[PDB]
Amino acid sequence: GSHSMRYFFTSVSRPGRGEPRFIAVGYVDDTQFVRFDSDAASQRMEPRAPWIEQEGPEYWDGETRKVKAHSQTHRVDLGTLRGYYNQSEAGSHTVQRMYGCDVGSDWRFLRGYHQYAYDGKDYIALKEDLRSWTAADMAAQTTKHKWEAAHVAEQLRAYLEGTCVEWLRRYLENGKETLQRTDAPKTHMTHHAVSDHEATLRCWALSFYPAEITLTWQRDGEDQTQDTELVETRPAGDGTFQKWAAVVVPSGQEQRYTCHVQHEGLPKPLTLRWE
């Protein structure tokens, strides 16, 4: 039902090895559709989904111009942040920015976001009202003062509520086959002895889209969350995702253990059993 458009930007300083590395990617939901890499030969925003390829030369020219403008902004930021934190010339540092919009099942605006991190920690974020800022430390307060005086939130709000939502609808429409699909997980459990008295029970979900999923183990109906090993949801490489959850149990107790799968493609949550 619900959809998102998000752009992700990463800039990394490399002191005495030239200019910072800048990478930008754009996603609709869990499907990537554009990239820019500062180190690549093309110096162009490039398509990474079949359905964006139909956009004409104005789009590619304008996206390339805007992405380079974003890059230059982060180039300046790396210098400014080194000053705010009294950091030395030599060490590598990382700025990240993410922004975009969520829409509901009816494709109307739900939420907007515009968040920044420095060296892996929250730095400054646009609040839910898109009128004010959350600044994570004293250096980010300096940025908040400058962004309040420059009316930054007002310019961001118009994009996030309007333009972002308009283009997300266009992409959803043009990529309908890919983007407005739901692939329910194909599920099973595997059993393997680890000794003569214990077995690994691993619950699998394969071939699903979108990536959001919940896999849980119960013992006699009680959640086993501290005893569960749950791996990160991972891409199969074909546009679908995979995940597993495992528990190690005493041999003979298999029938007490059930795996539970929730996904938007399932007409009902599934319970998998060993009997």
């Binding site: 752009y7 754009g26 789009y59 304008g62 996206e63 805007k66 992405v67 974003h70 902004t73 300046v76 930021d77 400014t80 942040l81 705010y84 922004y99 920044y116 730095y123 400054i124 940025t143 400058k146 962004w147 009316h151 930054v152 007002e154 310019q155 961001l156 994009y159 333009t163 972002c164 283009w167």
Partner: peptide
């Protein structure tokens, strides 16, 4: 499409 900022 991308968004008109420095810290």
């Amino acid at each position: 499409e991308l968004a008109x900022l420095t810290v």
